């Protein structure tokens, strides 16, 4: 077999008390009213979740597998990883990352603290001797918020994450931060997706498409694709790892990590019972975001030799992969696709949705977002990144009415901060919040391509210029398309109307002005689209000042990385 998981009977367990509904209060209500939509993922739905992860895998590899490897591996072979001290390591730890068993959390972490570091040691020392045995994991189900979808069903099960004790992901950065930072990129060159800026990004799509003499591409969703890994997929990723330069007891302790964690291991649940076993990739460890790229990237490569797709580029970020190539004609790239899936199928990833051939850029979905067109002050064309704004408006107003440890709606406005919904609803919302309770000055969590970063509001402006360009504050005449899905959204969620929005924003512009200094540039750039007469916006001075540098270098999600 190689299932992915077997399970003992003992049930996936929270350790405290789990909000499931969205409160009713005047903040969040005066951002969305139809409150009985937005719910959150909890324990009580595990069960289901296991029943979909669970699963035989089959696989049959082959010649295209076995020559992109070896190709892979020879660029692999032209890195040179370090190891990183302790401190390095451990600066690195979020300070709201799970506490150890073993009597110190995260803040001791942070903190150098003689407890927690040796503690590390031992493990450590531990990775080195011992070669084999398997090491504990604890197994939790997510709380996330979503809209309720009543079309496609009605709710979404948690999905479980999978993670090892906090002085073990302290040792994995040790080993394998600077190769899960470096390698990808040296081996996957301009397919590698964490590497690129929002504009970088959108850039490299538009210009991809408009290099094929007549572009086809898709996205390829594989079906559960963490349960799709399996032991040989995690042997593969880690030759691939052998291949870099390293220290003899970084290559130790990666060859330890693999057997005894990567490739599987036990699965504990809150209370301490033993849950079952895992087979395939954890969530929760610092190798999935760059292990499920590389698998991802080798699987596809070799699938599209099978298919014999014509001049294919490839972006890959994790499990999202999206293929724009030469069409062919439309039957024979209908054929062609198919043949792609087999391929990927026998190499065990077979898809949710059947992919299908588009012929329209602003078409393809790839994580989560979609390319459109809006103009700039002077009329000039301006291609950016947008998605349905369902899930970033209820967890808006989740967060507005709970306090979370991360922001996702800072996320989503440095990310998406040249969409319509994000200037309109999320900075008016959110900046009328801050200043009413002035803390625009007060730094707050957000992810940013799965790493932890703290920002400050204020800094908003030279942040987005950075990412987006100065075009990012003057875009008008966006497509109806993308109107008119934001307008549906917000009568299916009972969010105000955009009318109603840009009053709004023009008293928060007007209080934000009042203050003067970095609020009264976050007021000048980000409302700009508020008022008619409008200002003249140069480049601010602070932006080339910013220092960016690790972030856009590498995916992180689920590999506990804080960046100070
Ligand atoms: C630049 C663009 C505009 C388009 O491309 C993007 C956009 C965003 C991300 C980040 C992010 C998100 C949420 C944000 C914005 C709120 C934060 S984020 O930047 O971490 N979502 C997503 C998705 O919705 C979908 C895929 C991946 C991620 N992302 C992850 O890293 C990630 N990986 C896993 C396993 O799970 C998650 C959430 C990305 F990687 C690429
Ligand atoms: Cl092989």
Same mark, same amino acid.
């Given at each position: 077999?190689?299932?992915?998981?077997?399970?003992?009977?003992?049930?996936?367990?929270?350790?405290?008390?789990?909000?499931?509904?969205?409160?009713?209060?005047?903040?969040?209500?005066?951002?969305?009213?139809?409150?009985?939509?937005?719910?959150?993922?909890?324990?009580?739905?595990?069960?289901?979740?296991?029943?979909?992860?669970? =699963?035989?895998?089959?696989?049959?590899?082959?010649?295209?597998?076995?020559?992109?490897?070896?190709?892979?591996?020879?660029?692999?072979? $032209?890195?040179?990883?370090?190891?990183?001290?302790?401190?390095?390591?451990?600066?690195?730890?979020?300070?709201?990352?799970?506490?150890?068993?073993?009597?110190?959390?995260?803040?001791?972490?942070?903190?150098?603290?003689?407890?927690?570091?040796?503690?590390?040691?031992?493990?450590?020392?531990?990775?080195?001797?011992?070669?084999?045995?398997?090491?504990?994991?604890?197994?939790?189900?997510?709380?996330?918020? &979503?809209?309720?979808?009543?079309?496609?069903?009605?709710?979404?099960?948690?999905?479980?994450?999978? &993670?090892?004790?906090?002085?073990?992901?302290?040792?994995?950065?040790?080993?394998?931060?600077?190769?899960?930072?470096?390698? %990808?990129?040296?081996?996957?060159?301009?397919?590698?997706? =964490?590497?690129?800026?929002?504009?970088?990004?959108?850039?490299?799509?538009?210009?991809?498409?408009?290099?094929?003499?007549?572009?086809?591409?898709?996205?390829?969703?594989?079906?559960? =694709?963490?349960? $799709?890994?399996?032991?040989?997929?995690?042997?593969?990723?880690?030759?691939?790892?052998?291949?870099?330069?390293?220290?003899?007891?970084?290559?130790?302790?990666?060859?330890?990590?693999?057997?005894?964690?990567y490739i599987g291991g036990p699965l504990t649940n809150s209370k301490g019972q033993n849950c079952g076993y895992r087979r395939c990739r954890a969530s929760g460890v610092l190798?999935? *975001?760059?292990?499920?790229?590389?698998?991802?990237?080798?699987?596809? $490569?070799?699938?599209?030799?099978?298919?014999?797709?014509?001049?294919?580029?490839?972006? /890959?970020? @994790?499990?999202?992969?999206? /293929?724009?190539?030469? *069409?062919?004609?439309?039957?024979?790239?209908?054929?062609?696709?198919?043949?792609?899936?087999?391929?990927?199928?026998?190499?065990?990833?077979?898809?949710?949705?059947?992919?299908?051939?588009?012929?329209?850029?602003?078409?393809?979905?790839?994580?989560?977002?979609? /390319?459109?067109?809006?103009?700039?002050?002077?009329?000039? +064309?301006?291609?950016?990144? $947008?998605?349905?704004?369902?899930?970033?408006?209820?967890?808006?107003?989740?967060?507005?009415?709970?306090?979370?440890?991360?922001?996702?709606?800072? @996320?989503?406005?440095?990310?998406?901060?040249?969409?319509?919904?994000?200037?309109?609803?999320?900075?008016?919302? =959110?900046?009328?919040?801050?200043?009413?309770?002035?803390?625009?000055?007060?730094?707050?969590?957000?992810?940013?391509?799965?790493?932890?970063? *703290?920002?400050?509001?204020?800094?908003?402006?030279?942040?987005?210029?950075?990412?987006?360009?100065?075009?990012?504050?003057?875009?008008?005449?966006?497509?109806? @398309?993308?109107?008119?899905?934001?307008?549906?959204?917000? +009568?299916?969620?009972?969010?105000? %109307?955009?009318?109603?929005? +840009?009053?709004?924003?023009? *008293?928060?512009?007007?209080?934000?002005?009042?203050?003067?200094?970095?609020?009264?540039?976050?007021?000048?750039?980000?409302?700009?689209?508020?008022?008619?007469?409008?200002?003249?916006?140069?480049?601010?001075?602070?932006?080339?000042?910013?220092?960016?540098?690790?972030? &856009?270098?590498?995916?992180?999600?689920?590999?506990?990385?804080?960046?100070?």
């Amino acid at each position: 077999s190689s299932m992915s998981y077997t399970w003992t009977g003992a049930l996936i367990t929270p350790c405290a008390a789990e909000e499931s509904k969205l409160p009713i209060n005047p903040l969040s209500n005066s951002l969305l009213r139809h409150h009985n939509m937005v719910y959150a993922t909890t324990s009580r739905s595990a069960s289901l979740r296991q029943k979909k992860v669970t =699963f035989d895998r089959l696989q049959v590899l082959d010649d295209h597998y076995r020559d992109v490897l070896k190709e892979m591996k020879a660029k692999a072979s $032209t890195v040179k990883a370090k190891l990183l001290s302790i401190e390095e390591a451990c600066k690195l730890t979020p300070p709201h990352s799970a506490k150890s068993k073993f009597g110190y959390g995260a803040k001791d972490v942070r903190n150098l603290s003689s407890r927690a570091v040796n503690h590390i040691r031992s493990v450590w020392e531990d990775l080195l001797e011992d070669t084999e045995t398997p090491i504990d994991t604890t197994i939790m189900a997510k709380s996330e918020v &979503f809209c309720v979808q009543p079309e496609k069903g009605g709710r979404k099960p948690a999905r479980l994450i999978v &993670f090892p004790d906090l002085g073990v992901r302290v040792c994995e950065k040790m080993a394998l931060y600077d190769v899960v930072s470096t390698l %990808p990129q040296a081996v996957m060159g301009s397919s590698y997706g =964490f590497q690129y800026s929002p504009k970088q990004r959108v850039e490299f799509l538009v210009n991809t498409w408009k290099s094929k003499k007549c572009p086809m591409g898709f996205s390829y969703d594989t079906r559960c =694709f963490d349960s $799709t890994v399996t032991e040989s997929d995690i042997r593969v990723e880690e030759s691939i790892y052998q291949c870099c330069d390293l220290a003899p007891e970084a290559r130790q302790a990666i060859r330890s990590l693999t057997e005894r964690l990567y490739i599987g291991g036990p699965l504990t649940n809150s209370k301490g019972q033993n849950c079952g076993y895992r087979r395939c990739r954890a969530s929760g460890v610092l190798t999935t *975001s760059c292990g499920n790229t590389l698998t991802c990237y080798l699987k596809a $490569t070799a699938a599209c030799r099978a298919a014999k797709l014509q001049d294919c580029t490839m972006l /890959v970020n @994790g499990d999202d992969l999206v /293929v724009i190539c030469e *069409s062919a004609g439309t039957q024979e790239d209908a054929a062609a696709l198919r043949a792609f899936t087999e391929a990927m199928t026998r190499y065990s990833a077979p898809p949710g949705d059947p992919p299908q051939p588009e012929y329209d850029l602003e078409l393809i979905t790839s994580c989560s977002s979609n /390319v459109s067109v809006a103009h700039d002050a002077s009329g000039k +064309r301006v291609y950016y990144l $947008t998605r349905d704004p369902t899930t970033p408006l209820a967890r808006a107003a989740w967060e507005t009415a709970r306090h979370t440890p991360i922001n996702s709606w800072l @996320g989503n406005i440095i990310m998406y901060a040249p969409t319509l919904w994000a200037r309109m609803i999320l900075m008016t919302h =959110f900046f009328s919040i801050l200043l009413a309770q002035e803390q625009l000055e007060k730094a707050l969590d957000c992810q940013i391509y799965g790493a932890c970063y *703290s920002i400050e509001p204020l800094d908003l402006p030279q942040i987005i210029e950075r990412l987006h360009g100065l075009s990012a504050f003057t875009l008008h005449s966006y497509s109806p @398309g993308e109107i008119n899905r934001v307008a549906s959204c917000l +009568r299916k969620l009972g969010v105000p %109307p955009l009318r109603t929005w +840009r009053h709004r924003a023009r *008293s928060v512009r007007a209080k934000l002005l009042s203050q003067g200094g970095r609020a009264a540039t976050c007021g000048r750039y980000l409302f700009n689209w508020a008022v008619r007469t409008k200002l003249k916006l140069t480049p601010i001075p602070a932006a080339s000042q910013l220092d960016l540098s690790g972030w &856009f270098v590498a995916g992180y999600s689920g590999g506990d990385i804080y960046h100070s």
